[PDB]
Design a protein around this ligand. Sequence first.
Ligand code: NAG
Ligand code: CU
Ligand code: CU
Ligand code: MG
Ligand code: MG
Ligand code: MG
Ligand code: MG
Ligand code: O
Ligand code: O
Lengths: 325, 325
Amino acid sequence: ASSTAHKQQDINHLLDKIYEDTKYPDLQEIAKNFNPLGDTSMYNDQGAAAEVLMKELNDHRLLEQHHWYSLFNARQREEALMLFAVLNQCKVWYCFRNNAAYFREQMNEGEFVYALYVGVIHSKLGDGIVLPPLYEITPHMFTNSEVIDKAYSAKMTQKAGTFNVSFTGTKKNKEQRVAYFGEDIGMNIHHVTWHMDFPFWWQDSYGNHLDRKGELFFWVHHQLTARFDFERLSNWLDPVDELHWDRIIREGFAPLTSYKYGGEFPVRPDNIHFEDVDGVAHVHDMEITENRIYEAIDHGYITATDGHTIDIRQPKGIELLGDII
Amino acid sequence: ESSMYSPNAQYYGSLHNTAHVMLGRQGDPHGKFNLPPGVMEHFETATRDPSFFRLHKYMDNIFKKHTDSFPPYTHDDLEFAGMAVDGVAIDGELITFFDEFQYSLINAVDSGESIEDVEINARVHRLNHKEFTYKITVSNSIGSDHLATFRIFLCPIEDNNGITLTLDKARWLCIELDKFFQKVPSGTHTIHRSSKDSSVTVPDMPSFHSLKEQADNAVNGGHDLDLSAYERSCGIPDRMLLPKSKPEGMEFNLFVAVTDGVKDTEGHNGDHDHGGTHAQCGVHGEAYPDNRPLGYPLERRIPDERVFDGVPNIKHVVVKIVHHP
Ligand SMILES: *[C@@H]1O[C@H](CO)[C@@H](O)[C@H](O)[C@H]1NC(C)=O
Ligand SMILES: [Cu+2]
Ligand SMILES: [Cu+2]
Ligand SMILES: [Mg+2]
Ligand SMILES: [Mg+2]
Ligand SMILES: [Mg+2]
Ligand SMILES: [Mg+2]
Ligand SMILES: [O]
Ligand SMILES: [O]
């Protein structure tokens, strides 16, 4: 039951038709009858993570199904990580599979998919599993709205079809010349998977340290930026400018993409100044934060909570900067 | 500035020198037009540009926040015990005018192979003033002769709107006219000081032609060359000692502070030769001969003019300067 074949099959089934109740009777039975609190010896933490999540569920404090999910939303992330924490404590596959089946039917689908992916990646139980490409598990997040609408039409008419995607914007938009870079479905999987492998929410109490993570954070994004500029150079364009909090964002964007639940992704006009975002930050807060990071760089040390100096004039300095940035 | 004496250029950078370049390049800030550096990017030319003085007032105000942070001087801080300035007077009228000055342009033109030079000169109108003599009557009621520092400033009485300035509002606008060290004998004596001897100023430079003539005559005749009567080129030009003023005349405060020369010159000898330009240009190859803060005693806030008026070794008098057009 812990064989790679069965674990892979289990994961395939859990991720199938993710917006609907599971169509697999064996997963249905588990979701109905399994008790995450029913055997604390299943877990390396004596059952604590399961208690934490079940209390949120039983108190009706979890995000509803059929709702957008953003990893950058603090509360939604906290909920996804409560399920990750349970999966991460399972000693044996049946604990992992049964909790995943149980919470698939109780939790928001975006949170569930996120937690299951990082759970597989960061548990030794996940070794050998190949995660399906997210562009087939949640295609809305990788497919423009026009093609999704054709897929909806194919389903409404019960007729199979294959539909061509053809990049956002018009030829009048010079930025479209390089749309094949950032819209490539594999480039997007690269990016999501890097962050799943090296999550900003990681704590070593989850089981292990992620070596040089802050420096790898700098490097992977430096390479994304440098690779994009090489596409611009290939297409008779100048390099990208850098963002400034007090200057206009020249290039707007119309995603022409939609959530499965939540509506169309919002458009940004050309040539707009940053505005304060209610519930997030003031633009001035971003400037102050930037200033404080540059203060550390130019001091050669990061300032600890009690004021003492943390030396960054050494090879680990770039990593510590990644940690704080 | 910053200089190589800065303890931390990585953090504090180089505000003033970088500002020269920032301002100098505002005619072509991105290098699109292939323009050469601005006049602000050479000390030969920087003061030609009006913005020089706006930039340097900006910098001056940074220094001023530091100098304003100290406690105002007290009576006991300022009093040179037993030394009274009884009177301050000037022998001769304070008169400015413009006269003519010539210099050679030969080095600027291109000389042909085996064709003869021709004399090519520029004639400029320059500010100048007539010679005058300070007459400072001091009473030394200490039981012995004492070294004194004579500090002489010119201060505005009213601004361009005809508003009378307080001492605190005048002090940062005062210009240094002289500083010299002289033994004051016991009793009452009038000290005489020629305008030509100011430690703030130096004469017009000797011409290139004159230096060639003198060096050639000495080398060709086997004579020793003695140029020791020539002064340094650092220092306000003698001719610009006084402000232009107006044809109708303008009144100014002539401020004289007589301070304890034994204290001011301690470690630098009050008999030794300090050269002709020590007020702002120091002494070639030697330590700076006046231990007091630059600008003493005007470099701290004076919120209460009564403090200065009660110090016998400080006195100011009204003088008139007339421009002859
Ligand atoms: C979609 O692309 C394929 C191959 O590029 C082509 O044969 C087909 O005609 C295209 N369909 C449409 C509607 O353009
Ligand atoms: Cu990223
Ligand atoms: Cu300067
Ligand atoms: Mg459901
Ligand atoms: Mg912030
Ligand atoms: Mg002199
Ligand atoms: Mg007094
Ligand atoms: O300067
Ligand atoms: O300067």
